[PDB]
Amino acid sequence: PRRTPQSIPYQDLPHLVNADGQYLFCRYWAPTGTPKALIFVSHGAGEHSGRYEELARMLMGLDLLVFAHDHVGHGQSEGERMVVSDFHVFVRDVLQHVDSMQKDYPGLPVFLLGHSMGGAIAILTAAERPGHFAGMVLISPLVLANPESATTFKVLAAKVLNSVLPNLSSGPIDSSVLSRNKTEVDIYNSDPLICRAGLKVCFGIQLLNAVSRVERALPKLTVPFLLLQGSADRLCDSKGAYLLMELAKSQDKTLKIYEGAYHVLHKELPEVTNSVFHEINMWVSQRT
Numbered sequence: 001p002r003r004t005p006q007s008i009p010y011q012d013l014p015h016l017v018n019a020d021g022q023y024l025f026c027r028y029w030a031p032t033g034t035p036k037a038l039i040f041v042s043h044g045a046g047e048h049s050g051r052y053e054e055l056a057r058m059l060m061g062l063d064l065l066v067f068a069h070d071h072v073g074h075g076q077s078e079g080e081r082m083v084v085s086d087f088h089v090f091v092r093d094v095l096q097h098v099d100s101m102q103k104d105y106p107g108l109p110v111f112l113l114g115h116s117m118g119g120a121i122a123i124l125t126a127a128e129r130p131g132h133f134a135g136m137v138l139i140s141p142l143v144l145a146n147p148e149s150a151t152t153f154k155v156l157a158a159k160v161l162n163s164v165l166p167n168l169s170s171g172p173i174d175s176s177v178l179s180r181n182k183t184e185v186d187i188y189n190s191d192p193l194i195c196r197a198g199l200k201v202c203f204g205i206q207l208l209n210a211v212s213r214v215e216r217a218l219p220k221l222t223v224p225f226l227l228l229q230g231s232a233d234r235l236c237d238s239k240g241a242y243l244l245m246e247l248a249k250s251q252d253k254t255l256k257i258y259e260g261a262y263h264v265l266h267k268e269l270p271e272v273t274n275s276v277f278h279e280i281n282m283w284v285s286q287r288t
C-alpha cells in the first residue's frame with residue numbers, strides 16, 4: 001500500500017495524483033451550505049497545508065470552500081524532500097487541483113492565498129490563467145532574490161555546483177527570523193511535517209527560477225490582490241512588496257505594511273496576527 005513519507009496509508013487520507021503519478025495529500029474546510037466562492041491555500045518551502053488551519057477556519061466562516069494540498073516533496077505528499085524537477089510542477093499541480101474543484105462547484109469564483117514560496121506559486125498560477133481568478137491574498141510572497149547573494153557570480157557558481165552536487169546544502173536557515181512570536185518559532189521547530197534540513201542547490205536554483213518568472217509575470221498580472229508585508233522580514237525583503245505594487249497592472253491592489261514584523265505575519269505577535277486575519281476577512285468579505 002502507498003504510504004506518506006511518515007508511513008500512513010494514502011487510502012485513509014484525502015489525496016489526488018499529479019501529472020507525474022505522485023500522491024499529494026489534500027485538506028478541505030467546507031461550509032454547511034452551497035459556498036459563495038472557492039479559495040486554494042498555497043503553503044511555502046519546508047512547510048505544509050496544516051499550518052493554514054486557523055486561516056482556513058476563518059475563511060470557511062465566510063461561506064467559502066477552502067482547499068489545499070501539500071506541494072511535491074512537502075508535508076504528507078510524495079517526492080524527495082524540498083526538491084522539484086522544475087518549479088512549474090508546483091503551479092501545474094495547483095491548476096490541476098483548481099480545475100477539479102471548479103468542475104464540482106461550477107460558476108463559482110476562485111481565489112488564491114499564498115505565503116512566501118506559496119505566494120510565488122499563487123502569482124504564477126494567476127499569470128497562466130489571466131482574468132480567471134477573482135482575487136489573490138499574498139502574505140510576504142517570494143518575488144525577489146536577496147541582492148547580496150544574487151550577484152552574477154553567486155548565481156553562475158550555484159549553477160556550476162548544481163551540475164556536480166545538486167544535493168549539496170548550506171546550513172539550516174535561522175528559524176528565529178520567521179516570527180517575533182517565540183511560541184510560533186517553537187511550534188515550527190517541533191512540527192514533524194516541516195523540513196528544516198538545509199536548502200539544496202538544486203532547490204535553491206528552482207527558487208531563483210521562481211523569482212525570475214514572478215518578476216517577468218508582474219507587468220501582465222491583472223488579478224485583484226491584497227498584499228501584506230512585514231518591514232523587518234529577513235527572508236522576503238519589504239522592497240519586493242513595493243516592486244509588486246509598482247509593476248502589477250491590477251486595477252484592485254492594496255498593500256499593508258506591518259512595522260517591525262518578521263516573515264510569517266499570520267503567526268506573528270498577536271497585534272499583527274489579529275490585524276492580518278481581520279484584513280484578509282474584510283478584503284475577501286467585500287469581494288464575495
Ligand SMILES: O=C1N[C@]2(CO1)C[C@H](C(=O)N1CCC(COc3ccc(F)cc3Cl)CC1)C2
Binds near residue numbers: 115117211235
Ligand atoms: O511559515 C513558514 N514560512 C516559510 C517556512 O514556514 C518560509 C518558507 C518559504 O517559502 N521561503 C523561505 C525561505 C526562502 C529561501 O529563498 C531562497 C533560498 C536560496 C536560494 F538560492 C534562493 C532563494 Cl529565493 C524561500 C521562501 C515558508
